[PDB]
Amino acid sequence: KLINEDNLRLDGRSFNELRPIKIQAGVLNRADGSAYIEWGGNKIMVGVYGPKEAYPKHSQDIDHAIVKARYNMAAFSVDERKRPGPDRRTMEISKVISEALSSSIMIEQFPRAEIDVYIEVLQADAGTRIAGLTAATVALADAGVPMRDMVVGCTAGKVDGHMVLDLSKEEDNYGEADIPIAIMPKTGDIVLMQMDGDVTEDELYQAMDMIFEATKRISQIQREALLNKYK
Amino acid sequence: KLINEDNLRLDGRSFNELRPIKIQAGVLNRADGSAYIEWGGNKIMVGVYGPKEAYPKHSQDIDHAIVKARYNMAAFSVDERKRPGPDRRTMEISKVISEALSSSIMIEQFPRAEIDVYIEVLQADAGTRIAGLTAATVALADAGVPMRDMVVGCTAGKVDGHMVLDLSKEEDNYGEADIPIAIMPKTGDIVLMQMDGDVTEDELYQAMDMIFEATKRISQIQREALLNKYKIQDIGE
Amino acid sequence: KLINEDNLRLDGRSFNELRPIKIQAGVLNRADGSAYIEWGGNKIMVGVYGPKEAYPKHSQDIDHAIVKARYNMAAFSVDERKRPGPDRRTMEISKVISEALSSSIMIEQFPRAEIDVYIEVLQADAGTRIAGLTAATVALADAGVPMRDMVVGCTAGKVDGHMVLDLSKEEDNYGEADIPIAIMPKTGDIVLMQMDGDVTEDELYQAMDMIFEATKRISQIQREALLNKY
Amino acid sequence: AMYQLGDVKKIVLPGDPIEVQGKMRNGVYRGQDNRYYSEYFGTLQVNDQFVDVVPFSGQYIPRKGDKVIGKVIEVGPSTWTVDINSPYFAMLHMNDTPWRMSSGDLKRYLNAGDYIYAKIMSVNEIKESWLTLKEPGLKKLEGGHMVLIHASRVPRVIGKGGGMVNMVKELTATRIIIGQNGLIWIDGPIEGVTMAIAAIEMIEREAHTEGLTARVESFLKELKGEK
Amino acid sequence: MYQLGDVKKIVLPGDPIEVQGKMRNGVYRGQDNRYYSEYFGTLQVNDQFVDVVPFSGQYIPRKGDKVIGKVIEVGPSTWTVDINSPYFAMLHMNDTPWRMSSGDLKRYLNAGDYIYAKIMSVNEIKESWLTLKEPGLKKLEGGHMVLIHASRVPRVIGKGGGMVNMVKELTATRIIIGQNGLIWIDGPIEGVTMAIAAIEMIEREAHTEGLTARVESFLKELKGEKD
Amino acid sequence: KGGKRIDGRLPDEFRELTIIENYIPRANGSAYVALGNTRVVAGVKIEAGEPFPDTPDQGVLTTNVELLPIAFPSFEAGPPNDLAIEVSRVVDRGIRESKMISPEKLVIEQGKKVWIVFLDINVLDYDGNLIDASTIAAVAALRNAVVPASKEGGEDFKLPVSSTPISVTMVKIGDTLVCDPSLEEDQICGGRITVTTTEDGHIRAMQKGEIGAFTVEDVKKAVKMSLEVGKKLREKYFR
Amino acid sequence: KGGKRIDGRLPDEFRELTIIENYIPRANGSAYVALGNTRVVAGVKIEAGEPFPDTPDQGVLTTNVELLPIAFPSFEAGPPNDLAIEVSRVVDRGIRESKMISPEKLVIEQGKKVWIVFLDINVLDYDGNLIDASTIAAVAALRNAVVPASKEGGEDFKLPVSSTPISVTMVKIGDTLVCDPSLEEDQICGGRITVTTTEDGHIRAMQKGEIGAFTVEDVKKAVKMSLEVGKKLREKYFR
Amino acid sequence: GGKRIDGRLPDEFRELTIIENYIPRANGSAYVALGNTRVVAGVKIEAGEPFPDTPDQGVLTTNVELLPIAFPSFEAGPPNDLAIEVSRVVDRGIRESKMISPEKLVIEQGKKVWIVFLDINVLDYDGNLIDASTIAAVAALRNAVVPASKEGGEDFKLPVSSTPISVTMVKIGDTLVCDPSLEEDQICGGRITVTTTEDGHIRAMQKGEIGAFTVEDVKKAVKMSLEVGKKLREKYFR
């Protein structure tokens, strides 16, 4: 019933060890920018369209652009076949991702514009929403969308009294906490943050530093995924 | 369990024999153009409204008009009671009939316009999708909609190794194939064609030739239904 | 099986007795006009927004305003938890109330306008639809929406051969008839009237007279409601 | 070949071949074989030189000069869009009105939903109509009841020289405006409108009888005598 | 820490730019008063200015470009034209060769008509104003519309327009190329296939010398191979 | 006016009616009805299903009226569902409250299987007064009773019909109350009233619709007129 | 200016609260909450149902928050469900992860029947800070626990309440973090953070909302404040 | 001109890449890229209640999602008609070819059968969705893997009894071509899809879009669809 035996997690990682992460950018042909990510069992496609003016003028917004990110899960993407289409869960994710991306994208550079980010998760492991946000910045730099930073993030949480990094599906369902956080690496500003479970003030501050130091290991992947386009 | 004994179908027809067909045009009062059809067990009402200048968002497509044919089944029309409203099947039929009709309607004559064809099947036997299109051209002619031809069609298929015409509901469910086809008679051009089941290249061409022969008889039922409405007397058809 | 033994109803009332009714005005902050109403077990909140211009202009109607009353039931308002959102019943109720309200609101004074009436039932006894409408007129006057009268109404029906007033949920489900009616008190004109069940002409007129007598007292409870608030 | 008549050369269906000499006009299209074929179900009316196909339909084609009643559907910054019961909506420019307005003030004079009795200034190739209100008698219609009839029966309802339409007015005690588009504006007393309607429906339905005037006058007197 | 003699070090969004010169498009000032890259791109320095060109698309319009655009909305005095840019461009009625009154914009250009126009001005928000008054600017009627990357437009036209003109005669077609990547093609039913086929070969393979010589050989083979 | 409406009809006169039983022979019961130029066809579909938990010893009747976009030009512009729903509820109300069906006799295995009565009405042509047209169609269709009891073993019997409810719609043209309004008369006056009656002289259902008011006397006249014209309608077609 | 917010409130002060337990008595448990001019009413309906197949020895708790159109002029323009759904999930996350309910004791028949606890919150009046008001109302309504065991035989007992989760939502005005933002302050600044805490000093749920970013110091101060105003609140209204 | 707009001849398909077991958490899955049209098919098999009429048969349900990531113009249109047609066309090919053998998917006759969910997500649209979905659909059903260990039993391979190959064809000018790219898909109105099995039989046909075909064109489309269906079967579905 319990998650670790030798200070070893069910999948054999130490406490602060990431799952395998791959990111290829520019995989899509039609999309202005695109990024494919593999994070554990997660396989997520992201494509980015825009910035363009809205037609008809009704949905327009005169201050800045609008980031409309849509997170959708394939019917074969979860354990039991799920009905296609958004639900309460995907709608909460699409908002929280849209809000974070609005903070790094230089939204004042396209007034009255709309920026579509389509995140299609084709197979889902845990922490799924962050692999899509991690890929959203990759697709956005592919599309020439101006950003002041490349948002990046990772999960942490409490499992059998220990604070661990990048929880697996088993660790999420039966562990004590899950903390997804996404930051602007230049500043350390948090643009996404949720938390589930049971944690002390001390463990939460521990969890944060763990994520913060995993962001450096992740950002490198993102930066290497756009760098392989030229070469 | 078999459909034929003496080369006679369960309902008594030869292979290339139509079921009884009726068409009356201009039977609806509100519709700009209308047509009723009875094709075997099928009872289908057609209404045509338009063309007009529309209204809704990105519906003001400037090249031509828009044929919005909507195929709808009454809840009492099929074997088991069906929920009111369109479904996945009725939306597939609505497209294929709209595509077909957009080829005979002279669609360029009304840019920015919209043309509604509501096809309401009140009772369905097999091959309903053709019976409605066949009545739709009558309802379009009744409404003064310009057309370059009167689209007409018929169903065919394989039953116990033989190719037969105008399949019945029993022949549709238990046959080997079903092939609904609609054409423009002048030219022989195909605007609507589907096919389900299992058939050889040779049998399929034989079934095409049977449908082309039937369109001669079906076209004539369409024509007379228009002639009838505002009297006939003296000759000229 | 039956509702009465000593000519007494299940809750102890006589035949023509109203259940207790309270109405408090100006209870919402955001709404232009508001009214809380308690009618027996019924707890109904009404809020009024408007009159203002319609956007988009598509739905605009250009002779007069449009009264959009929306009747919604809270999920915890009925016996078993019901899934939030409108259904066939609540749409019919929204229309029949929108229509009745249109007869008293001076609709012509605001062409192209919209007037929103949100009726949120938090807890439902029988006769809900009159209870909101009776509270609705209060909200409308609380919002300054011009009216030519204060709509008021009441239910009646037949239970074991006796014609009774303001039926309860039990008497509604198992009684023989239910007749909800709403009138304009100046003229006595009926702006809302429905009828379910089985009744003779004679009983139907008896039920009407009983309802007309009760509306005098309910209309005063409406008057008081507006009075205190200022 | 097939049967033809002496001046109206037989009834035709969409796609019937037209083997007649002359300048092909509305109702006829040229097929891929360079032959001509019928576009409509109708009669192959063939006038001098020109060769049409008139159809058996409705959908009133508005042409220059017709006086029509129309409902304003949209108020633009400089034009009103008016539905004249025709496949395309008609336009009324602000300069084609007797009102002095600045641009954007169009809602003070005509709102959407308002009915107008105007004249068709022009019809372009697409049947798009431009309207005017400057001539005497053209005006906004306020109050009353609107009736729709088929435009093909409007000419009998008006009658030669406006006799029929006037004659009704006095028997029916009402003001009546008839559009060439089939819209008729009626406003009288609450009663007068009822007789006026009853008469028009009899006229439209029975628009073949020569003694139409007689019946319609008597039918209105019979409804008049019965009160 | 890094960087070459003149093209420095290819940057990512947010990489710090510690270089002297006038910051221009692609660089923003952080809260720490340092400059950082806005784009994933190349840091481009000349004696006066510091930029980061990105590896992107979304063609920006600059004054003077001749472009193809699809009209999306017909205003009272202006047309809204999509020029394949983040913002729609505006064509006022007074920048046209047509004498029109306000609201008659639909007689000359409707939505969806494609026009070959010239960029009159680009404001700070990249909104474009168009004109059609100069010779050669016109409505495009009929034909097939092709989109290629705007960065590939100069090679497809070629030095002095030789390549584009050369195809036209080889393809027996009229071809108009807009700086936004939209290419208008209308010829015979066949020549359109070759003109398209040539453009994709030119777009994909733009960087080789003798690009002129392939297109000529490729087009000559296509004419021969059915004959 | 002087005893006539806009048509020849007197204030208490209906339009010409044609009722056609067994119009949809593949349904359990059906009927096409034309009321003047208003045309609807109702269809009755009977199936075995599970009863409601509260009433385990009763069959089920569910009613639906489709205002098909084919029936009117302005239909699907809107389409406001409000009118289509009201009619389905009002029509249902007459049939249900008249106890026409006897839904206790439709019990197959008490609390496990009952008979589901689908009563579906498609409007093909709208020329006013949908309620009365739908009710006539509904009643007539229920009279091709034909419950398929051979499918649950048993024996195909005629669905029990215990009364004949007739709905009557009334409006006030000027100062006179008329019934069965045409579409034109339906627009000359705001305010209509439906009163459904049975052959026993009982009122089973009432419904005031549309914007406008009726005085108590008007309501009194409409009850008498609906009873009277309901008796006339019952004798002509529902012998 | 004087250490005070746009109203007299200090950075750590909530608005006036009024909690009215058993506001909807015909429900098993209920609570009306007014937080300034933000008004919501939460209702709990407990019913016997089938547990989820994976956890057969545990009852179910489902939460749903209704942003009624009465509550704001702009409501039904939009209405974006995005805000209404988000509040449902945050309120449910705080209640679920605090283990307030103790759902193993809600088992009637292991693996067949458990107690399903519907928590529905209707927002009647909107003046900012829906998240905290909704959580308070939900907590209070869950304390009128009254689970109806008498319908399943047994004995009516109090639904077990094992903790007191108090959520506090915080926004950044200028350089200072304040809590319980009014509607003015909710729009004055992009960015909010909600921290739900139990009386044991544990953090049970967090949620950053709206467009905008927070430094790590801000987040540390928000967790510290939420525990500190969360403790003050717990003693004042949930003694 | 004797060749197409690309190097393709009239009977040449674009480059195909098929990837079996692309979604290992699905019972069977396959990614297919046909040129720049990219879809991934995923099969989820579960025990459920059969349809009342056929209580001794399994169920096959098909659904094709045109995800908005797949094309810029999506939500301009996007016509839902198109997504639904492809689901029905694709399902028709699998059903009428008797690929699935739905009688062997019976767990408890008249109570429990195997429901085979075939869900195809379109990620990139560059024309010819129908053939690309069929290829993904055929392959994904060949990672058959029905989870019979959850119903006791034994995990077996879902029976696949035939290999239907669907071919979509358009007429550019006077020449019929197959596998139309998006560019060719718009250069001529009117496409025709003919699905064939390895027995030389035609199992499904469908005329689509606005436009007409002569009787000879349909005769050429059948010859070409059978012939290129044979090439495709031998190259990827041996």
Author numbering:
A (entry chain C): 10 to 240
B (entry chain A): 10 to 246
C (entry chain D): 10 to 239
D (entry chain I): 0 to 226
E (entry chain G): 1 to 227
F (entry chain F), G (entry chain E): 22 to 260
H (entry chain B): 23 to 260
The authors write:
The exosome is a multiprotein complex that participates in the processing and degradation of RNA molecules. Several studies have linked exosomes to the quality control of messenger RNA (mRNA), the turnover of cytosolic messenger RNA (mRNA), and the processing of short noncoding RNA (sncRNA). Archaeal exosomes, unlike those of eukaryotes, contain only two RNase-PH-like subunits, Rrp41 and Rrp42. These subunits form a hexameric ring where Rrp41 and Rrp42 exist as heterodimers.
The full complex structure of TaciRrp4:41:42 was solved at 3.5 Å and refined to obtain an Rwork of 0.23 and an Rfree of 0.27. The structure belonged to the P3221 space group. The overall exosome structure of Taci consists of nine subunits, three TaciRrp41 and TaciRrp42 heterodimers forming a hexameric ring structure and capped on one side by three subunits of TaciRrp4. TaciRrp4 consists of three domains: an N-term domain, a central S1 domain, and a C-terminal KH domain. Among the 29 residues, the majority (17 amino acids) were part of the NTD, while 11 were associated with the S1 domain, and only 1 was related to the KH domain. The neck in T. aci consisted of four residues per domain: Y64, P65, K66, and H67. The neck created by these residues had a diameter of roughly 12 Å. However, this ability was significantly increased when taken together with the TaciRrp4-capping protein.
